[PDB]
Ligand binder design. Structure first.
Ligand SMILES: CC(C)(COP(=O)(O)OP(=O)(O)OC[C@H]1O[C@@H](n2cnc3c(N)ncnc32)[C@H](O)[C@@H]1OP(=O)(O)O)[C@@H](O)C(=O)NCCC(=O)NCCS
Ligand SMILES: CC(C)(COP(=O)(O)OP(=O)(O)OC[C@H]1O[C@@H](n2cnc3c(N)ncnc32)[C@H](O)[C@@H]1OP(=O)(O)O)[C@@H](O)C(=O)NCCC(=O)NCCS
Ligand SMILES: CCCCCCCCCO[C@@H]1O[C@H](CO)[C@@H](O)[C@H](O)[C@H]1O
Ligand SMILES: CP(=O)(O)CC[C@H](N)C(=O)O
Ligand SMILES: CP(=O)(O)CC[C@H](N)C(=O)O
Lengths: 175, 174
């Protein structure tokens, strides 16, 4: 049982703690330096009206986050979003990641986006199989795109497509 | 004249060249023409870590080739993104591939691991220039952009180098 809701500035210290754990312990994230809560708050405020940012509360505690942002800052990409999801390392494999992402994707689809792209640092079987279970299709892979944790790691692109006409209408904000 | 390092005085000419493709083609996914200072801010920020080159003909800028970061996360630091534009008239005089060759030999010498090109499709000329220089097709996003009345895919081409492990810091252009 998890309350899926919109992320607030008060959730960011907890979100920052979760993601920092994977930055240090895993190559799932290509950052090599932990983040501070305010950097997270800055991205949220800048993106939450235009892209969905969701947290999952469990027993009053933040147990995961799923958020979206722009793929690239050029206008033709405006209908292309990038998605991300992180679950606390003690609440994994309980369905929170899929529940968060399902809510994220329905918002993105209702808003009028064309597609959603996921950038997965490989290897990462849990994230690959979750994304492919929710309809993401493999699209590409850059070889040795990053050096983290003493090795070169490929990065893969997964994409989930929605149906839009020609021309597409400007996408709706979250509200 | 000829091929040299880009200066702040070259940016207006560079901006005029690229704006031509912003306004008339889908090889780049901007819909809003640019202003020379956005180029100047990038040049000054990057010219010491990444090569920024211009080609001259008759003392006039005829094309630019530059590299920059692929993604702003430190693991990507040995991965560069490459770009090249030639003025409409100077196309098919060996300028592009010659510009790109000098750009690539600098990136390999500085100690980068690979070079990535993001090509908005259709773009048969660019696909061919890149694969002729050793780039391999590595992926493609479907209908990633809408411009000029249609959806357009975008493809990724990659040129791989070889580095020792752990890799040393990339050397500056100087
Ligand atoms: C990837 C992640 C978000 C998955 O969320 P989750 O809540 O743990 O997984 P779920 O309970 O929602 O399960 C959904 C599907 O994900 C897959 N999956 C999740 N964990 C898996 C694991 N260890 N091994 C194999 N498949 C796994 C399964 O296909 C699962 O389907 P199933 O439960 O019906 O068998 C979670 O593992 C995580 O936070 N990893 C660290 C951060 C990360 O990698 N984020 C992805 C960035 S690309
Ligand atoms: C793409 C571009 C840099 C090619 O460089 P160029 O100076 O025009 O062409 P070059 O003579 O230097 O040679 C480059 C190679 O690419 C191919 N090529 C170049 N122009 C081509 C054209 N109109 N049609 C088909 N192939 C072409 C050719 O294989 C050519 O080799 P070739 O001389 O043996 O035919 C240039 O045409 C350009 O600026 N195009 C528009 C902007 C652009 O597409 N940038 C790509 C960013 S991803
Ligand atoms: C390519 C310049 C990288 C700048 C962006 C990353 C900032 C934090 C780490 O920087 C390091 O600085 C070196 C330059 O001396 C690089 O060679 C090295 O790979 C990179 O890990
Ligand atoms: C490999 P990367 O660090 O570029 C992105 C990882 C993850 N999808 C996220 O969005 O954090
Ligand atoms: C299709 P896009 O606009 O993302 C990049 C086009 C060209 N590689 C460039 O860097 O100008």
């Amino acid at each position: 049982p998890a309350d899926i809701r919109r992320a607030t500035e008060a959730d960011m210290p907890a979100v920052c703690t979760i993601v920092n754990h994977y930055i240090e312990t895993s190559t799932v994230n290509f950052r090599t330096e932990p983040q501070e809560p305010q950097e997270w708050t800055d991205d949220l405020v800048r993106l939450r009206e235009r892209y969905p940012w969701l947290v999952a509360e469990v027993d009053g505690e933040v147990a995961g986050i799923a958020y979206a942002g722009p793929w690239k800052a050029r206008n033709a990409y405006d209908w292309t979003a990038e998605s991300t999801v992180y679950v606390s390392p003690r609440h994994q494999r309980t369905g929170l990641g899929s529940t968060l992402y399902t809510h994220l994707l329905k918002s993105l689809e209702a808003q009028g986006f064309k597609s959603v792209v996921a950038v997965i640092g490989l290897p990462n079987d849990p994230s690959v199989r979750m994304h492919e279970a929710l309809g993401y299709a493999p699209r590409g892979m850059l070889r040795a795109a990053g050096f983290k944790h003493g090795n070169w790691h490929d990065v893969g692109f997964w994409q989930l497509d929605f149906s839009l006409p020609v021309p597409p209408r400007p996408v709706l904000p979250v509200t």
